[PDB]
Structure formats: C-alpha cells, structure tokens
Amino acid sequence: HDINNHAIKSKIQSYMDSKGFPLQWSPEEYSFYFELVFRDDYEAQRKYLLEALASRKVS
Amino acid sequence: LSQLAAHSTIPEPLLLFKDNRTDTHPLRGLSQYGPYSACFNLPGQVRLAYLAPTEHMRKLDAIVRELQNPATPKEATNYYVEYGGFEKVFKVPLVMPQEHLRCLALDECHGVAANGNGLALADKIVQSMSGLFRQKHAFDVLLVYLPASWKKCFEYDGFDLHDRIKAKVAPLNLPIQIINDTALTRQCRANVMWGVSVALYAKAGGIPWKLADWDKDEAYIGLSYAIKKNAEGQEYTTCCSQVFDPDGTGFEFVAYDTRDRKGNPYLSYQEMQSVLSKSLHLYQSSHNGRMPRKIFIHKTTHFTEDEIQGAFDSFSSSTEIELVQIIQSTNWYGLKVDPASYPVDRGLYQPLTESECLLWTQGSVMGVNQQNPGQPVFKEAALTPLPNPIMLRRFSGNGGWHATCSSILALTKVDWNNNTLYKKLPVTLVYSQVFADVVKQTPEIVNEIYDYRFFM
Amino acid sequence: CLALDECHGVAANGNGLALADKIVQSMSGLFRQKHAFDVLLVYLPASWKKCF
Amino acid sequence: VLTDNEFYQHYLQNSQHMMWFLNIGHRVLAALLEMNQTKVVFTTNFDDVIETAFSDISGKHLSVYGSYAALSALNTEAFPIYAKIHGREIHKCFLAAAIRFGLVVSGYSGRDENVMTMLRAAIDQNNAFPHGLYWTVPSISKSEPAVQDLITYAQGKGVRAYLVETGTFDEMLSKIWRQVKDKPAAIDAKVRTARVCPVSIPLPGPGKPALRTNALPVVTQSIRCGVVTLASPITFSELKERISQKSPKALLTYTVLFLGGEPEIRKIFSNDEINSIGQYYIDEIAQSVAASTFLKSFVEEAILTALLREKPILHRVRHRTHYAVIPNASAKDDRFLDLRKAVGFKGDLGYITGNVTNAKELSWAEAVSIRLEERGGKLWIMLKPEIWIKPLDRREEATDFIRSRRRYRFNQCSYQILDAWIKILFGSIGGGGTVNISCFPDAEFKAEFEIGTRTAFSLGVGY
DNA sequence: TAACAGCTCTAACAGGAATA
RNA sequence: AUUCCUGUUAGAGCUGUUAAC
Ligand SMILES: [Mg+2]
C-alpha cells in the first residue's frame, strides 16, 4: 500500500488517532512523530532525514 | 497480574455523502448534504407501485403521503434528527403512483389466509403482482402490504412469509419493501420515516451513503449459515457475501449460496475453494481484472484446518488473506473508568491473546447525539444497560489488529436496511445471514448471485 | 432495459442536458445488476437527432 | 537490551550495509542477497540451502568460500559473498568486514572460543561495527552467559552492540522482509513469505480512559488432587448419578479424579471396586483445563466450592453455569450493605431480595454468574451480575421485571454493583489483593487457590 | 457409535425504544 | 416485515475424554 492514496492515509491517521496521538495538521506533531519513531536517537534521526532529503531526488 | 494489553480506541468511521462531505452520523449527514448518489443523479425521480388488499389501500397512500411531509422524532430523540421529507432530504421527488401501476391483492389470498398455507399465500401474492411484470419500466419499487389478518401465515415452523415472498420476487428483478402493520403502529414517526425513506431510495438504485476513504483494493467476504429442521436430520445452508468497492465511485454488495447436502456448517476443501474462486471472479469482473491485494473473511464459526487451506489455494501470492471468526457470545464485558457516566467507547478493541481480541462494536459514540450536544449516545440503552463486546479469533492474518478491527467497525455502518447508528455485526455477516435464510426457505436460488438491494 | 418515455418528450423539447440525464437515470435497472453484465449497448433513435 | 521492533527499525533504516552471521528464512536471506542488500553473510554450519535458494531466486551461482579468496572478494567490493567459518584466512576477512559495516548474528549461541576470539579481536579497532552489533536470540534469558558477557564488553568499549530478543530466525527475517521496499516482482513471486498458519500477533505493552473488565486473574499455576483406581471400567454418567444419589462432601470427575475427604470416597465407592488411592499433580493448570473439558468443569467447580465455603451466600446452578445467589435468610448481613447501596436508586437503600410485583410466588434475588475462562495461558474468574428467580423453570414469568430492574443499571451503577459483589465474594477491595481460598481444608486432598482480587483492566496507550 | 464435559450458534417467541 | 438485539425456551454442530464395536 502506497502513502499518497486517500484510503491508506485515512486508515493510518485513524490508527494514529486510536493510540491517542495528535489529531491532524496541528502544532507539536512533526516533532512529536519524529521523537516517537526514533525514541530520542538523534543519529538515526539525522540519517533518516538525510536519506529523505538526499541529493539524488533533487531536480 | 491485573494488567492487560493496552486497549486502542478505533475512531468512529466516517460516511461519504453528496459532494463527498463526510459525516459519522448517517441521518444527520443525509439531512445536511443528501444521498451519496445525488451528485450522479442515479435514481432520478423515484417511482413506486403498490400491491395490497384494497381494504387497506388507503393506508399505503397515507404512509407514502406522510413520506412527503416533515416529521419530528419523539422516541430516541437523543439520536434522530428532524425529518424533512423525501423531496427535501434526498433532493429527489417522490412520485405518486398512477392507477395503472397501483395493484390490488387478488381475492383468493384472503381465502387461503383461513387455510394457513404459507406457500399458497406467497404464490397467490406473486400472481397478484403478476400484473406488474410487464410494466417493470414504469415503477422502481413495489410496496407489498401484508395485513395483520394474515399473521397466521406470517411465521410458522419451516416457513417465513417475507423470506418466501422475496425469494420468489428476486429472480423477477423487482425490489419490494414489504410493509406490515408494525410500520404504521410504531409511535415515533420520524424513526419509521427515516427507515422507509432510506430503504426506498437504496432499493431504487441510489446509494444513501458510502464508507469514507474506503480502499477499493480490499474485498471483505462474510460467510454465514442457517438451520432447516429436516425430518430425519438437520440442514445447514451456508452463503457468502461481498462488500468490496469497485473502481468506480459506487460500491457493491452481493451475496450468493456456497454450493449438495450439508449436515455441518463447515465448508470442505472443495466447497470453500469454489465459493472463494467465485468471489474472486466477482471481484475481478468489477475492477477490470485486478487481484484483490487483501481479503477479509468473517465467519460465525471457527475455520477448519482443511477450510483454511481451501481459502489459501484459491488466490495468488499477492493476496493477503485475514481469516477472522466473529463471536457474539462471550463471558467478557467492559466497564469504562476515567467510572464514566456513559458506557465504554464504541470501537475500543482489547487484544486478549495472540489471535484473540475483544472488539466493542456496541458502545457510546461522541458527537453523534442531537439533543444535549457534546454528549455520548448509547444506541442500545433501551435493550441492554451495558454493551456486549464481540470477540475476534484470528486464523490467518500475518499481523495487525487495527486492519480487521477498523474494517469491521466501518462495515457495521453501511446497512441501509438499518435506520439506527450501527449494528452488532459487519454488514457482510448480517447480509450473509439474511441470504442464508432466503436460500434455506427457497432451494431454487443457489444458481445465481444477488445484490443487496433485493433482500435488504 | 427500456428507456423512459420521458426521454422522447425531452428530445422533442430539444434539451440535451436533460436527455442525457434521463438516459443515465434509465440505467438503474441494470445498476441493480451491475455485476451481471460487462458492456452496455446504449441505442439512440434517429428521432433524438435534434439533441445529438 | 532493546525491543525487537526498534531493532527492526534500525535494520530497515540502514540495511544496505549490515552483515549476517549465522526454509523461509534461508530463502528470504538469499532474496536479500540478490537485492544487493546486506552484501556479506557469514555462517558456521554447512547449510548449502542458502546458495541453492539464491540460484532459484536469480538463476546464477553464488560465491561460496582459497588462500584469501574472501579477502580478494571483499576488498574488490565484488559483493555478494557467502563465506563459511568452518570453526585465520577468515580472521583477516572478518576484521576488515567489521571495519566496513555492522553485524547482526542469529542462530548462534557462541560456545565456540575460536569465533569468540574472532569477534573480540574484531571489536578492538577504532571504528568497529559502526552501525552496531546485534546478537538476536529467540529468548533473552535462554542465551548463554558468554553472549551477554561479550555484549557488555563491547558496550564498555564504546561500540553500540545490542542484545535484542526476537522470534525464530526465519520468522525474524520474514518480519524484516515484509517491510523492505522496492522489490522486483519475480523475487516476491518466488518467496511470498510462504503462508502463516499459526497466527500469533504480539500483545502491546501495558501502556498508560481505562476499561475495567470483570475478569479476576488466577495465579495458582498448579494444584494437588487425588486419584482412585478401579478394577472395572466406569462411565462418567454412572459416576455422576452415583454422586447425585449419594451427595458426598467432595468433588469428583473422570479423567477417576477427586478432591475431598477419603471417607467420602469410601462412601461413594465400595472397597471391592477400589484398588488404591494416589495423588495427581497437574503441573500446568491452564494447559490441562484447555486440553480436557472434564478438567475444566472439575477446576471451575473446585474454585466455586472454595469461594462460597465460609460465606453465607448460597450456591446454585443454571444450565451448567454456577451462580452465587443471595439467600433470603442471610440477606440482612452488613456485608451486603454496600450492595444495598449499589442497587439503590438515587442514593438510597436498594432491595436485593424480595417478591416480584406481579407474580404469585416467584421470589427474586441478586446473584452473580461465576465462570472459568481459559484465555491464552491464563485462568480468569468471570463475574456477571444477574437477577435470579427462586423457581428455576418459572424464570421467564419474571422477564418483564428483569427488564424493569436492570433498565437503568448503567456504567456507574454496574461499576458499583461489580465492586460491591467483589467485596462480598472476597472481603477486600481490588487494591493489592491476592486473597486465598481453600476447598475442604480439613481433608487429605484439599485445593487452595489464590485469586487476584482486582479485576483485570488496561489503560489506553498514549504519549 | 454411545455417553459425558465445554463453546457456540440458530430456531422460535416476546418485546420496549436510547442517563431515566 | 422501517428498524435495533435484549431476554426466554430448546435443539443441533464442533471439538475433546472414556467405553467399545
Ligand atoms: Mg427492509
């Protein structure tokens, strides 16, 4: 399942809301999900942020 | 040791309406935005015909007339919204039937009412409606009325009057919305009006609402069974149902028999693989031929060892099969504490053990109530004081309670025949049960698959 | 299926939009059996030429 | 230590460069080798199925390991290689590989000093296992002490070695592969992760609007009981009718198993039919009552007998389900006062046993159905409040009344009812409660069960 | 194949209307 | 049968454990 699908986005957001996480595009969400996924591991966080914003997809 | 795995509260699923304006509460969304198919104008005007004894004909007119007038709820006012009439709420005119379409029940039916012969009464009713076989284009929905005087043949051992009538009329391809004295009797007028209006609109061909952001690549199968009390032994009638969403905008809901004789409700290797192959072909026909990337199966009883392999052998590797058994009778029941003034939230699922979870399909829902805004609503507060959690037993899914739990929770909201907020079971289970009753009453239906709009 | 006779009245009125809407609305009988068929052969009589 | 899920996350974030030191698992390892991820894999056993799976996946042979062939392949960056330790020609190769990228070792408990010194020598260098060393075992506590010693030594040295607990190596690799991205169609067709027949999805952490269930945990993992030996075969129906006609002060079943006093056994069974009396120690109560239904009924009846042994409440039976029904004579006890408060309407005293308003002789009382639930490997005592009617076969005549009384027993009222009934049945509130009950304490074969007083509950997981 | 235990479901009736 | 599924009364099917045929 992809990520830009509407159905999968709604299902994932409903799952996130099931565990009491912030609702929708609200403050303290981006940092919240980063600190949730990477559980305070700034090296792994840096590596992921490098991979997502790497210098191969940029045109 | 008194600590259990952390429960997760699945949010209340949203329903899709006209102009894709989502809402959790179905009837309120229907009032505010209208039916989902209103943008497509699929039903257009709704044209309906009558078939009842003349001595009660006026009653039908009355209810139909009162379908075209606003009604304010008096019972369950905490949930039901003010009715605005068919013309306003559904954005569709309600057509007064002409005398040519209007039919009268043939007199001998009354006579056979004394004889207590259900089959004869059903056949006589079909012959009464036979005057409407040629004029199928003129009307969309037939309104058969069965008077209370026929109650002797309404229900008796081995026979169901409505079941037999619909089983006889479905192969002729004309929907009926049978109306008895109950619909007239029933105090709260808005409740019945919502029920009949939604039922008629959906039977015409429209879609009152659809699951919001529903995945079109997942098909949710549901198998159920019914009892026929044979003289020598028992007979188990097993039928399947599908609620998938095609590549279009509308969504499908079709049931079919699983078939020669069965004494146990467990499908063998051959029968289960056959019904699943038929389901796969049905799904392929709608989506140009694409495989279903994930299949849900809801059975009322546990899957056998051979049955699981039969389900597997019918699909390719890409398909993900999550066999699920739904159990309604459990010793468990939940109490919500923060002691909450309202029962445990609907959708709160509790993973008990590996491949065993507790889903609270029944429960309080936030923001749905109309009176006293901002308060939870318990739909079944009249019957039970506290909700009864159903139990899922997983048999095949690789992982994830969220997928099955959210799928089932959303599926318990698209029963158009139901005029309340939700059900106890997914629509797959309830429609498979209804078609199981239909097939058990009438053995000559096993060949063809039928849409939900016929038997709903 | 059979097209509504109101389609003829709309065609005589020369209203293309309403004629197309009526043709689509005539499809409900088949839509109750959408699984049954694969392709629908919609025919238009020459009398509707005024709205073609 | 670290949870398997975070280990999976770290492996998936950087899997292009991570080792593998060592069926579905072997086949998917070959698939990962084909996909150019996890270039270098080391192994100890023969396990010639890795190269066969790779050949099936791709259609070309696999380099299997000359003097320094592994060194030549690694230095030239001509991945992938599959070198077997067979435990110095690999010593230098392992050292260079440890310099290059991190290692995950599965299916190995250590116990070999050669590879132990190999890895310890690989650790010392300045940048050894930069991504991390991951010793994965099916169970953390079952691992050999040398593995934990090496993990602690590496952590002290500054390396990021970890010991994570996962499942079987093949299951671990399947869970890893189900989340690897951008895989060719042919490979997925080849592997497809086979099929998962025995579904087992992990229960989440306890976490922290909680729900309070009615289940009371049973922590008595084993009980002692008696066995009687018969010179002739018996059927369960014959035993049941013998108990009905005699009514001894003991609990009987066939599997012949008993619990109570020996003189009651001598009463129920004559000397001629009795051979000897011995003892049975059912080590795993949960598994036993799950496998055999006779044990299930016997154990639930034993707990029931132990629960109302010293209490004034009466014990009844309805469709083979036991009920703790309040007797009319002892309905005025102070212990029921809390229940008097719970049934009470709008904060008043509430009747708990009386006469139904519109029937001649039916008398109603409050009661709880007590059942045994074997869930997973745990025993739960299941409490369900209910209204009992004195005539068993006339209950339906009070149906309307049953609907009338419970019509407004909502969440707060039902919570009060359940708490009051727990207090009545056990004498203590659900705070630090592991009270003990015993059935037939004055008998040779007695059963003592310790039931957690607090009902099972769980808090919703949140941030 | 005949009992026994439990789990679970349907078959027929009856039945009131959503925090009082 | 506009609906909802709460009870009651029963039976069946699955598993098991014995006795065998
Ligand atoms: Mg209906």
PDB file of C-alpha atoms (C1' of nucleotides) and ligand atoms in Angstrom, chain B residues 162 166 176-178 199 203 417 455-456, chain F residues 1-3, ligand 1:
ATOM      1  CA  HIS B 162     -41.397 -12.289   3.862  1.00  0.00           C
ATOM      2  CA  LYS B 166     -38.623 -12.009  -1.560  1.00  0.00           C
ATOM      3  CA  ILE B 176     -40.173  -4.852  -2.784  1.00  0.00           C
ATOM      4  CA  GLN B 177     -40.236  -3.081   0.570  1.00  0.00           C
ATOM      5  CA  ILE B 178     -42.781  -5.173   2.466  1.00  0.00           C
ATOM      6  CA  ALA B 199     -34.827   1.804   2.205  1.00  0.00           C
ATOM      7  CA  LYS B 203     -33.895  -0.002  -3.430  1.00  0.00           C
ATOM      8  CA  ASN B 417     -31.988  -1.514   5.931  1.00  0.00           C
ATOM      9  CA  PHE B 455     -33.062  -8.682   0.101  1.00  0.00           C
ATOM     10  CA  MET B 456     -32.430  -5.603   2.248  1.00  0.00           C
TER      11      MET B 456
ATOM     12  C1'   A F   1     -41.854  -7.459   7.757  1.00  0.00           C
ATOM     13  C1'   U F   2     -38.920   0.718   8.704  1.00  0.00           C
ATOM     14  C1'   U F   3     -35.525  -0.968  12.320  1.00  0.00           C
TER      15        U F   3
HETATM   16 MG    MG G   1     -36.311  -3.837   4.594  1.00  0.00          MG
END
